[PDB]
Amino acid sequence: SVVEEHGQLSISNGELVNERGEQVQLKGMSSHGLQWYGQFVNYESMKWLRDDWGINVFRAAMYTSSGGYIDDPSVKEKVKEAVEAAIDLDIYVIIDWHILSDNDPNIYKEEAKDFFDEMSELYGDYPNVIYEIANEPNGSDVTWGNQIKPYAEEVIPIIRNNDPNNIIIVGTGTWSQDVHHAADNQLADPNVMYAFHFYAGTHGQNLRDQVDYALDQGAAIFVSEWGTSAATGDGGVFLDEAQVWIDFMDERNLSWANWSLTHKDESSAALMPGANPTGGWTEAELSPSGTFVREKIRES
Template identity: 65%
Template sequence: MFKKMFTVFCALIITFMIVSFVPPQKVNAEANSVVAQNGQLRVSGNQLVNQAGEAIQLKGMSSHGLQWFGQYVNYDSLKWMRDNWGITIFRPAMYTQDGGYVNDPSQKNKVKEAVQAAIDLGIYVIIDWHVLGEKDPNIYKEQAKGFFAEMANLYKDYPNVIYEIANEPNGYATWNGHIKPYAEEMIPVIRSIDTNGIIIVGTGTWSQDVHDAANNPIAQSNIMYTTHFYAGTHGSLLRDRIDYARSKGVAVFITEWGTSDASGDGGPFLAESKVWTDFMKDRKLSWTNWSLCDKTEASAALAPGASPYGGWSDAQLTASGKFVREQIKSATPTPSDGIVSGKTYKMVNVGSGKALDAAAAGTANGTNVQIWDDNGTGAQQWIITDVGGGLYKVINVNSNTGLDVAEMGTANGSNVQLWSYGGGSNQKWSIVKVGSTYKLIASNSGKALDVAAAGTENGTNVQIWDDNGTNAQKWNLYQLN
């Protein structure tokens, strides 16, 4: 009798556990993110497409080796690049040798940190097995199988994740003799766990021989082939190879390119780089630029000593970094959906219910910006105009002056005022939709338009402050014409 009761009790407990502990649905934290909008990517013919079958071009950054510059791979730096540069993809470069995974398997923890940040931010991410010094990807094939099995088990339900299984085979490693056989062993390891994820395969001669792959492609779906270039070394010959490969029906993803020569130094060659970025734009070739680091070399995006956590001013970017930032911004869809360029709006703060207002209806440069009861005057009306790169100028109707961060300020508490519009970064704003409301992010600092101390009284000052998601930084925008 006791045994029977015990059996029934256990059955009830098991039933309770099955009903109660349903695995959480794996969704992106950012409802309006690029991943939320585009979902699980796939390959259609020679093109990367979104869940609706529309061609998509992803643009972003690759880290340098995580063992050397992993401090730049974190949630804050990725968030800064998403919000201020417009990145839609990030690639943490996990070397196999030289202190990488084979020498130190804990390097995968930094990859996991990057993937989780990408999931939280709603951007795509490439898990990179950075074959380089060993030349032949078969050298560490068994380690690669274990690594990708672990990654696929962790992230198989997330549309964010793309797998790059061999960065740059080189030397004696050929497509037919070494790389394709490796890929044909590696792909089933991932596919047995993640049936949908995009898998990118490197090609010979430091991923320049994409034509060889096109002549003998892998008989699997959702496979892409990478080409790497450095603008000071590689030109029309490599572009012709890409066009040839695409004409054969294979899809190409540029997982690494630099503005320098092939050494990573020399240059930057910005005119040649622009030829390449135009080429990639015309063909909707997705790319990540090498590299997010402060190494003293031409291809590095950051100046020596730049913060690991974003917030970079122009002075903290190299010539390459500034160029690449602008190429990422170019034609990157702005998240501020619903804004009609050139129209007049009033902006009402969510926390206080009061309108963004020019103090005393002032028209002079330096007029302070505050909140005040919504009164319908021109002092509370703003013409919002797209100025490119996902940025807007915000011009007060009454004074024809722009919303301006005083003295190019970047610190918390920097004052917001009106000033004649001159196109400075302190007068350009990202306008980002947050549910049914908006936040305004100053281009020069990445900080949000903020009501001081979350005040609600008439005359409370408006400033910039770290983006914190509070109602003091959320604004309802009402179109007036």
């Protein structure tokens, strides 16, 4: 239903629109690292998220380091399973080259180009696919102008050679928070979005003003990772501030993916320890975070 109705996505005047030009907002879940919690990413769990939660996008978080793709590349196959499931369920899917401790996207750029060549050659003629080429650039020595933009200008051409206009989400500086710098020095590709990430444990009023600054420069923004917890993914659940961000994203028509779908014992995890990896969760199998996220997407 979703992908058949909205079809080809694109960016028009800094907004995400469907193939008939109407604004569309995607809301879904991100996996946790596929090298650790890959059992939660399968057709059945994704189908349960779609039908019971109302998700319209799923994000496959393929860590590169921390036991991820560079150490064991077999995890790319789990990305393919998520993509195929999304195609079968007629929802959108984000392929995330999940950099983090490998804080500069240039560290593994050659592997990233090869990876994105393969993914775009395989799925480049489906409208479901959204490429996220560098999850969270971070560090004082990793800037938009010197490291991130140039990386993006190497990897985007590889993708575009196989897939001319599916959406590409590009990470920003300071753990994908520095949308200001990226919005003042935008990429040429017309179907790019800049990532913006937030954690409800952080007081967010200036961060909201910064997203508004970026939007005002005509940059499109995709909230490809956010949590109800602190920045570490644990440390409490902050639903009042999470609700303020939810409302802000609805007012600005910003698409988002919540972190994360796992049973790990950390506040941002959506599931409790005994949740079935294939779905069908009862209220008791959802954590306080997962209960809130599900309500937000159902309400949508």
